[PDB]
Amino acid sequence: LRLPSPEVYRFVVKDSEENIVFIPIIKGGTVVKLIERLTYHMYADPNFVRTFLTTYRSFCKPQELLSLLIERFEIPEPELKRFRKEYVQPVQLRILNVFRHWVEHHFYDFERDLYLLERLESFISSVRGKAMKKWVESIAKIIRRKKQAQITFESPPPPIEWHISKPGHIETFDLMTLHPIEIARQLTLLESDLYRKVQPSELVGSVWTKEDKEINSPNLLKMIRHTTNLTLWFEKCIVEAENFEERVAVLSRIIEILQVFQDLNNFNGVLEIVSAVNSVSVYRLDHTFEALQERKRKILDEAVELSQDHFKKYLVKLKSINPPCVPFFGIYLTNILKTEEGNNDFLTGKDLINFSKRRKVAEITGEIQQYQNQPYCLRIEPDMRRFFENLNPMGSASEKEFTDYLFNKSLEIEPRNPKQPPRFPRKSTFSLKSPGIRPN
Ligand SMILES: N#Cc1ccc2cccc(O)c2n1
């Protein structure tokens, strides 16, 4: 069975292709049918709960989800006993279990929106049922743990290598003054921490391209803005080296950073350097790449081939290693955009929420889960940490204005002619000698 009429309880409408399309794997359907399958009385679907709470923000606002769960909780009696035990009792237990996984795995919804938590804390306290008391106290315990959150080394860390810049003096920090070993170490520690803070909800629905990008995807933007700045900073250090002898040493020093990146399995930092040497302003410096050592150019050629053929050699290299590693985060964004555009957000006699598209984007984020919980055994350097955290090569100009500056500056150092590149006086004063890659 005896169920209420759909005129007062929308979660009881008969199933059809007008509201739901297919433990049966749910392909899609109306948001009312998705909440019913999320908190179904016949059985429990733990896999559907994890995928829904991970991708629901692309088709349902967090305030809307809590309102639907409250609507699903308030069940009216038909025009019983078994109904209050075979329908009301199981459904309300399913909703509380959804409240558990929500506040446990995706508590950031309540941090970004304090009003969303205030509504839940009042609705949870208002439930004074008998069997629901244990689940209510369980949710309250999880909320208390998340509210209280606001340098141990197992193995001996390696010593911090220094070159020309002595510690405590952030002013003289540059690409050539710092030690290339520690540059790749601190960049790996920074890229690792930025990689671990990225939540799968920040990569669903292209939310970093929407309006509220600074709220929905705060960590994803910092990972992209670091990749963008570090790639342009490498290009800036190459194209601004007007002296030919200095420009070869700078490019060689970057390859030495690429080699340490390879040894640390920081493919993100590996392919960021590859993105710099393949840029429009750096790739045309044929005379600079020609003056390299025979071993330096071979190391770069191997790193470029990792990205060739849709990262075929890279995907084989990422599997055959062991953590700690920082995988290339750009290959994940590319497969997500190809799915967000190749699949429509809705299914169609009526418009239904295309849930299978959200699942595909969830499978891409699932591959990111396995490379996060494995810290590096490298000691952090505070002065060098803020140096790469505050890298801003564009200054006040946009990326289009800065890339045009890099291309016009590239035409100055190595002009487009068969003639030799002119010699410019070196503006630096330090030594162009590299300390090497072997830890000294
Ligand atoms: N001449 C030359 C030249 C120019 C750009 C390059 C970029 C990556 C690898 C290379 O070998 C390159 N060689």
UniProtKB/Swiss-Prot annotation:
**Domain named N-terminal Ras-GEF: residues:** 23-147
The superkingdom listed in its UniProt entry is: Eukaryota
Q: List the disulfide bonds.
A: none
Q: Which residues form the Ras-GEF domain?
A: 179-416
Pathology linked to this chain's protein:
Noonan syndrome 9: A form of Noonan syndrome, a disease characterized by short stature, facial dysmorphic features such as hypertelorism, a downward eyeslant and low-set posteriorly rotated ears, and a high incidence of congenital heart defects and hypertrophic cardiomyopathy. Other features can include a short neck with webbing or redundancy of skin, deafness, motor delay, variable intellectual deficits, multiple skeletal defects, cryptorchidism, and bleeding diathesis.
Q: What's this protein's function? A: Promotes the exchange of Ras-bound GDP by GTP.
Q: What is this protein called?
A: Son of sevenless homolog 2
Q: Which organism is it from?
A: Homo sapiens (Human)
Question: Taxonomic lineage of this organism?
Answer: Eukaryota, Metazoa, Chordata, Craniata, Vertebrata
Q: Which residues of the full protein are shown?
A: 565 to 1041 of 1332
